[PDB]
């Protein structure tokens, strides 16, 4: 059984700047409901600071993956456990600011 997941791209602040349409099956929102919003706006109050801090550190880890588990508010207002694996990218031919690529998978807290 394939895990339900979707890819997103974020600026260093956390704002969704690209969202794969597999988000609808994973968390119930259309891409347009996520784009322009901070991922933290969908995060359980208890996990928000962890998520902020994860985004702040991933840019320091030389492109390695940083993982975080957090509760994501689905379109039905229910808390889903997500495991987000994130890493930075910047096109090496440029000095554009790094952005963050995330794979977001609904997982069990068991």
């Amino acid at each position: 059984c394939q895990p339900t997941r979707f890819i997103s791209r974020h600026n260093i602040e956390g704002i969704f700047t690209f969202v794969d349409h597999r988000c609808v099956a994973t968390v119930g929102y259309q891409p347009q409901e996520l784009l322009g919003k901070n991922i933290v706006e969908f995060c359980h109050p208890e996990d928000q600071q962890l998520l902020r801090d994860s985004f702040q550190q991933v840019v320091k880890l030389k492109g390695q993956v940083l993982s975080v588990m957090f509760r994501f508010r689905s379109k039905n207002q229910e808390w889903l456990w997500m495991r987000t694996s994130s890493f930075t990218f910047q096109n090496p031919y440029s000095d554009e600011i790094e952005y963050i690529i995330c794979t977001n998978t609904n997982v069990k807290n068991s």
Partner: protein
């Protein structure tokens, strides 16, 4: 002349290198619709002369968890090849996340 965002596209692969996702930026660059790549191995698209090098890069990706591919040619939908480089990352193994950036026009 194209800006950076336009020359980059994201893909996802199963551990056998079959596409499981591709972003639509590939269409303007290489010709493919993402839907037609799904379930096809990346290996179907490498130039013959890059095939042994990409096998090695895939081995390095699987052993280390990440790789920069080096330059290679991807077969374009309507003939010819585009030069690309790819940064691959294994998501833990669950899948491979690729950031792909085009280095040439179709040749």
């Amino acid at each position: 002349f194209k800006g950076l965002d336009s020359k980059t596209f994201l893909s996802e692969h199963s551990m056998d290198m079959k596409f499981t996702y591709c972003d639509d930026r590939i269409t303007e660059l290489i010709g493919y619709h993402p839907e037609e790549l799904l379930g096809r191995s990346a290996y179907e698209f490498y130039h013959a002369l890059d095939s042994e090098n990409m096998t090695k890069s895939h081995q390095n990706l699987c052993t280390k968890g990440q790789v920069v591919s080096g330059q290679y040619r991807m077969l374009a939908k309507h003939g010819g090849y585009v030069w690309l480089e790819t940064q691959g990352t294994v998501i833990y193994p669950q899948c491979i996340m690729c950031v792909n950036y085009v280095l040439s026009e179709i040749e």
